[PDB]
């Protein structure tokens, strides 16, 4: 019972290419509470609405989260015309999704910052990430890029963005609706 969002509140969130995926079945959730624990800067959805995704019953709910600087919002909007959707993280198009950009407030003291934001700028002929999967280069690219420009090959090149005062993160949600299995519901 009650969906277990606790693991997000403790630790250093991974970089975008190492996104952490939490799967929820048979549990009631409260997303509005989770988001109230943050300063929410952006909240867009595909094939569902912010209101609907906090108030619907699903067969499973998937929450991805990672460190992501709010200044790279453009790099998400560009979609497959840029490295993030090409090489790091790209949400399903067969299921409704949302992507949320958030700053962790000073008062929520138990989310730990990494040395910087990092992402894969190239990973190869090119090896693009398929919707909902990890980059083939997840093995060789380090948890954090050391210096903007590193070239790992066993060909994966990393980039960096300086750390902000307060950690900025991204949350990706994918819901799946079933038949006779929609038992991830909002609590009332």
């Amino acid at each position, epitope marked *: *019972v*009650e969906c*277990d*969002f*606790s693991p997000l*509140l*403790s630790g250093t969130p991974p970089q975008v290419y190492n996104f952490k995926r939490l799967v929820f079945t048979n549990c*009631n959730y*409260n997303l509005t*509470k989770l988001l*109230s*624990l943050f300063s929410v800067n952006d909240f867009t959805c595909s094939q569902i609405s912010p209101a609907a995704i906090a108030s619907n019953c699903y067969s499973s709910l998937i929450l991805d989260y990672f460190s992501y600087p709010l200044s790279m919002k453009s790099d998400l909007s560009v979609s497959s015309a840029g490295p993030i959707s090409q090489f790091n993280y790209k949400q399903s198009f067969s299921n409704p999704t949302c992507l949320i950009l958030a700053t962790v*407030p000073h*008062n*929520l*003291t*138990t989310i730990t910052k990494p040395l910087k934001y990092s992402y894969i700028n190239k990973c190869s002929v090119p090896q693009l990430v398929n919707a909902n999967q990890y980059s083939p280069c997840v093995s060789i690219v380090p948890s954090t890029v050391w210096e903007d420009g590193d070239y790992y090959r066993k060909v994966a090149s990393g980039s960096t963005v300086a750390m902000t005062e307060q950690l900025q993160m991204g949350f990706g949600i994918t819901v799946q609706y079933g038949t006779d299995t929609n038992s991830v519901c909002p*609590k*009332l």
Partner: nanobody
Amino acid sequence: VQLQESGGGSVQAGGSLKLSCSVSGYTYSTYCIAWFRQVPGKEREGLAFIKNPEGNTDYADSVQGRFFISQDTVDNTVYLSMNSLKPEDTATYYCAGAVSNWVCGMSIKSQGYGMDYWGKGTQVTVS
């Protein structure tokens, strides 16, 4: 939801004191109940917390194995048996509720940031 502390007062240097927190108004059964304190001029400190899918508890590390958060089986009132009380333990002790249960260990580490319902506090002074 309504929360009220009691049981405080003057404690001997070294003695123990049991505080309570009557809980009304909760409809579901999943939520966080925490215990806090604040000596004046300073910020609220998190102490102990309860989680109600199972009853798991934890305690901030400055009261480890001295303060013991319990909950009544039938009353759903939460207790706080405190032991080895030092003057540094003198504060106004607040009781706090939240709307879900995973919001707990965090607010216990962040002076009640995510807590929703609060009591007026009771006073504990150790000599």
